[PDB]
């Protein structure tokens, strides 16, 4: 209350560390407690975020989840007290999802791991390049709760990554969501999750498919029209030469006419 009893906090963080070592489940009482104290603002310190990092890097599922939900809660200020976020994300993606393919986590937990990885990556300009092929298995409309997965796909995109590994993603989505015969919600979800990719990685889809997607402006369904207008207004301010003359809306065209001579 008055002043932070460092002699006490530093002592009762050591027991959390020495609980998380015991690999059965006993770090539950460290994670559940450190989350409470962070929420009450009593343990705002660099020493504590390491505990939840180690929990996220643990083998027990209910401890890993406590760590992941701590670092989630859009993320919290604890990211700004990490020691190496890039190596953290690399170790997570290597241990849990891809490395051994132990298949311990269910889909509801895999999605929460994906959310954390993508939201760290987009925020801190990280580079892993395995993410973008791991998503492709799950990017199918016949898959369980894909609107969460594709909303994290965009969150791992940058201005500073090779756009080919995102081109393959966009061409998977385009092949499987805005193809022939697909439904209105499916096509609208595809276009909406592509334009919010291109808002971070603009040169990740080329003009030839950009035009194929702005085809769907006057689509009579009111989902695909609202979606295509967003892509058009996105590339009207960024790369309006990829768009055709029909779409450059009275100022992009005037800016191009003066700057083309």
């Amino acid at each position: 209350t008055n002043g932070k009893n460092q002699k006490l906090n530093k002592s009762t963080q050591a027991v959390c560390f020495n609980l998380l070592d015991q690999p059965d489940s006993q770090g539950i009482w460290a994670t559940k407690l450190t989350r409470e104290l962070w929420r009450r603002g009593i343990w705002d310190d660099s020493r504590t975020v390491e505990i939840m990092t180690q929990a996220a890097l643990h083998q027990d599922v209910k401890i890993v989840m406590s760590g992941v939900m701590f670092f989630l809660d859009l993320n919290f200020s604890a990211i700004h007290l990490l020691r190496d976020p890039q190596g953290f994300a690399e170790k997570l993606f290597k241990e849990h999802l891809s490395g051994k393919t132990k298949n311990k986590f269910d889909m509801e937990q895999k999605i929460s791991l994906m959310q954390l990885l993508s939201r760290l990556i987009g925020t801190h300009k990280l580079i892993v390049l395995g993410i973008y092929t791991f998503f492709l298995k799950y990017l199918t409309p016949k898959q369980r709760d894909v609107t969460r997965i594709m909303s994290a796909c965009a969150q791992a995109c940058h201005d500073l990554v090779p756009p080919e590994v995102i081109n393959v993603m966009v061409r998977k989505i385009a092949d499987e969501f805005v193809s022939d015969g697909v439904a209105n919600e499916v096509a609208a979800a595809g276009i909406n999750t592509i334009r919010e990719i291109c808002s971070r990685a603009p040169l990740a889809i080329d003009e030839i498919l950009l035009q194929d997607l702005v085809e769907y402006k006057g689509s009579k369904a009111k989902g695909v029209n609202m979606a295509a207008k967003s892509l058009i207004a996105l590339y009207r301010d960024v790369a309006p030469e990829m768009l055709k003359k029909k779409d450059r809306g009275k100022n992009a065209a005037m800016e191009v006419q003066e700057a083309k001579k």
Partner: protein
């Protein structure tokens, strides 16, 4: 003002009091002001600048660029002067840490993250195409402005307040507020 001139004059005289440590003392400006909280994302970034950093740059390039910049007095590299380096993290980190900055051709800023990916992006010296003062987490911010030119100090100060005590310093000299 010319209250900068009296400061810089006997700084240049301190130039000739403890003369030489057999190098050249660069000039620096340290910014101190309050009223902002960087733990919230109040971020700033601006690169509208022009020095003498004992220029040590490493350009990556092609045949068209390596024999362009063999002149110039510059360290240069092939693409497979980089391809045959990924096997050793501390090796690819030592070149990371060697040079003050990095540049590369317009072709190789698609391939450089596959090779020098984790490094060279958090370090804040990622290359830039050819043919900074980031408010990351702290209130403290120092920038190297020049060498042993009173204009440059004000030139940078108006830009910093443009973006938003002031101190000027040399390598071992004292502080002048």
């Amino acid at each position: 003002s010319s209250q900068v001139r009296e400061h810089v004059k006997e700084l240049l005289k301190y130039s000739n009091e403890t003369k030489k440590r057999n190098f050249l003392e660069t000039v620096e400006l340290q910014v101190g002001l309050k009223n902002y909280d960087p733990q919230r994302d109040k971020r700033f970034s601006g690169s509208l600048k022009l020095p003498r950093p004992n220029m040590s740059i490493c350009i990556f390039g092609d045949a068209f660029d390596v024999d362009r910049a063999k002149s110039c007095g510059v360290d240069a590299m092939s693409v497979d002067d980089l391809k045959k380096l990924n096997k050793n993290k501390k090796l690819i980190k030592k070149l990371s840490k060697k040079y003050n900055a990095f540049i590369a051709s317009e072709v190789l800023i698609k391939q450089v993250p596959r090779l020098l990916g984790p490094q060279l992006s958090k370090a804040g010296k990622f290359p830039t195409p050819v043919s900074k003062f980031q408010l990351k987490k702290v209130l403290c911010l120092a920038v190297a402005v020049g060498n042993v030119l009173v204009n440059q100090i004000l030139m940078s100060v108006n830009f910093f307040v443009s973006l938003l005590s002031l101190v000027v310093k040399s390598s071992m000299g004292p502080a002048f507020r």
